[PDB]
Motif scaffolding. Structure first.
Motif, short mmCIF file in Angstrom:
data_model
loop_
_atom_site.label_atom_id
_atom_site.label_comp_id
_atom_site.label_asym_id
_atom_site.label_seq_id
_atom_site.Cartn_x
_atom_site.Cartn_y
_atom_site.Cartn_z
N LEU A 128 0.82 -1.21 0.00
CA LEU A 128 0.00 0.00 0.00
C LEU A 128 0.86 1.27 0.00
N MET A 176 2.79 3.57 -3.35
CA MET A 176 2.02 3.68 -4.61
C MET A 176 0.57 4.10 -4.38
N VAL A 177 -0.09 3.51 -3.37
CA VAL A 177 -1.47 3.88 -3.08
C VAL A 177 -1.50 5.11 -2.16
N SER A 178 -0.70 5.10 -1.08
CA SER A 178 -0.70 6.18 -0.07
C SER A 178 -0.28 7.58 -0.57
N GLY A 182 -2.38 7.77 -4.87
CA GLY A 182 -3.80 7.43 -4.92
C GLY A 182 -4.77 8.59 -4.92
N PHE A 212 -7.22 2.80 -11.72
CA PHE A 212 -6.21 2.99 -10.69
C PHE A 212 -6.85 3.43 -9.38
N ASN A 213 -7.73 4.43 -9.41
CA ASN A 213 -8.38 4.93 -8.20
C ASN A 213 -9.45 4.01 -7.64
N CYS A 215 -7.14 1.27 -5.99
CA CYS A 215 -6.44 1.80 -4.82
C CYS A 215 -7.34 1.64 -3.58
N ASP A 216 -8.61 2.08 -3.68
CA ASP A 216 -9.59 1.98 -2.60
C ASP A 216 -9.91 0.52 -2.24
N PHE A 268 -2.56 -5.44 -7.12
CA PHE A 268 -1.31 -4.66 -6.98
C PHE A 268 -0.47 -4.71 -8.26
N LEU A 289 -2.21 -2.16 -10.66
CA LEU A 289 -1.81 -0.84 -10.19
C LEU A 289 -0.35 -0.53 -10.65
#
Length: 491
Positions: A398, A401-403, A406, A423-424, A427-428, A443, A446
């Motif tokens: 997470l 890349m997500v934090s 995102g 992607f969004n 991410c959620d 992942f 993403l």
């Protein structure tokens, strides 16, 4: 009877409050003053300081009771440094909307919501039992509580001083208590002999700011310092030559990269961003400036991610004809693109940049350095390309890349990355999903989207070098911190 420990450091954090002190320089001090409910056991099973195993620490035991809640049974009779007993009220206050993730709280602790999952209000069931829960599903609560978000603070002392004053006179349950701070100079801690864990092995720990690497190396040679931080592979041969000194290096869970101001016309489309990425020859940079010690990640993907690390993902592509296709198709007219760097705030930033400019020149791209001295705050409108780093702070995929990349975060909201809808949505989902085939596959989509969009270009995982006196037995960990529990003995 116990030796004092002197550490020559690059700098001090802006605060010793656990969240506001998050930085390259803060955790090494915060980790001594405080404990979390869960501890990352870096040396478990003979690992060389990089294990992701999580163990109970201030929690005697805990049980995940559903997809969003964990019941923590706390250790009883544990005291903070001011004599106050650690209870469920303090743990509830640590992860409360009042202190950490509320609208009012983030005005004093700006990263309280950013470094947290979607927390719901903690529930105190009795004096030593608290349920920590998230509003939506989260199978990462344990990893978050074992991270730099985790330190437990004293409710009544913290509330009487406030976050700012608490940061200058901190109180925790950890093996070393705060003695003094001299801003931009030093922090001294003293042994906490009332510590619930093992007895502290140093009488005191002093973190002394020595800005110049050479002056820091000189201090270790002369006997001013026991351990010194923030050296590079180029400094190893000099230190290792001395018989009573040695280097102790490690690959750290950090990522050196360069990113774009995607509001700007030249970088709103992915076409030129990808060209710059596909033209960088990372092994030649790592070979020439990092003595081949830095690691090139096979995507936005690192071993400490655990279940979400993909060891079969192939390296990031270096294709010059594909870059040239994109430079020509983008309509790039040869206008110079600036690359901002605060000197060598990130190790080897200016040498790496000068190597990348020649690689970019082969793809028909003109990039110019823009070295600004520390103090000069550049305006966002003045930025085309800028260097950056990201601590990979959860033992999960997470972060970052997500934090960071995102929805609702700085790369999209401030720097204008228009990420694809998938992607969004993914991410959620990965924040709410449990580890397995679905999350691991998500992942990879993403990561594939990230490489094709190139909102940033990953350069490498840096190799951090420490130096120490051989009569001080202490091993580095794979993170930007120092652990002395079961890892500090004087010969």
């Amino acid at each position: 009877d116990r030796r004092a420990l002197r550490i020559g450091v690059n700098g001090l954090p802006p605060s010793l409050e656990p969240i506001n002190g998050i930085s390259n320089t803060g955790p090494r001090i915060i980790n001594q003053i405080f404990d979390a409910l869960i501890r990352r056991d870096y040396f478990a099973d003979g690992a060389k300081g990089n294990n992701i195993k999580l163990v109970p620490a201030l929690a005697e035991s805990f049980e995940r009771i559903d997809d969003k809640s964990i019941r923590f049974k706390l250790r009883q009779g544990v005291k903070f440094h001011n004599g106050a007993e650690m209870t469920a009220e303090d743990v509830a206050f640590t992860f409360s909307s009042e202190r950490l993730w509320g609208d009012e709280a983030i005005k004093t602790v700006p990263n309280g919501r950013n470094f947290s999952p979607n927390w719901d209000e903690p529930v105190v069931e009795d004096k030593y039992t608290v349920v920590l829960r998230t509003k939506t599903p989260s199978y990462l609560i344990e990893k978050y509580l074992g991270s730099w978000l985790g330190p437990i603070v004293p409710k009544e002392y913290y509330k009487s001083l406030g976050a700012v004053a608490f940061g200058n006179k901190p109180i925790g349950t950890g093996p070393y208590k705060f003695r003094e701070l001299v801003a931009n100079d030093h922090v001294t801690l003293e042994a906490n002999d009332g510590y619930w864990g093992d007895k502290p092995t140093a009488s005191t720990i002093t973190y002394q700011v020595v800005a110049e690497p050479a002056t820091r190396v000189a201090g270790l040679i002369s006997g001013e310092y026991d351990i010194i931080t923030t050296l590079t592979p180029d400094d190893m041969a000099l230190v290792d030559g001395y018989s009573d000194l040695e280097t102790r290096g490690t690959l750290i869970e950090n990522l050196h990269m360069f990113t774009f101001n995607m509001n700007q016309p030249i970088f709103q489309n992915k076409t030129l961003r990808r060209a710059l990425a596909l033209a960088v020859n990372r092994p030649l940079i790592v070979e020439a400036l990092w003595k081949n010690k830095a690691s090139i990640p096979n995507g936005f993907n690192f071993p400490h991610y655990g279940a979400t690390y993909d060891p079969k993902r192939k390296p990031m592509e270096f294709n010059l004809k594909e870059a040239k296709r994109l430079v020509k198709e983008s309509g790039y007219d040869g206008t110079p693109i600036t690359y901002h760097t605060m000197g060598n705030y990130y190790a080897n930033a200016v040498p790496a940049l000068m190597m990348m400019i020649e690689m970019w020149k082969a793809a028909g791209i003109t990039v110019v350095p823009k070295i600004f001295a520390p103090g000069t705050t550049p305006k966002d409108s003045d930025i085309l390309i800028r260097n950056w780093s990201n601590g990979q702070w959860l033992t999960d995929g997470l972060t970052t890349m997500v934090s960071e990349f995102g929805p609702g975060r700085g790369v999209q909201k401030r720097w204008g990355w228009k990420a694809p809808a998938e992607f969004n949505n993914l991410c959620d989902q990965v924040a709410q999903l449990k580890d397995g085939e679905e999350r691991s596959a998500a992942f990879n989509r993403l990561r594939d989207i990230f490489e094709d969009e190139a909102p940033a270009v990953l350069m490498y995982q840096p190799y951090d070098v420490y130096a120490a006196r051989k009569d001080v037995q202490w091993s580095p960990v794979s993170f930007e911190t120092m652990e002395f529990r079961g890892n500090l003995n004087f010969k």
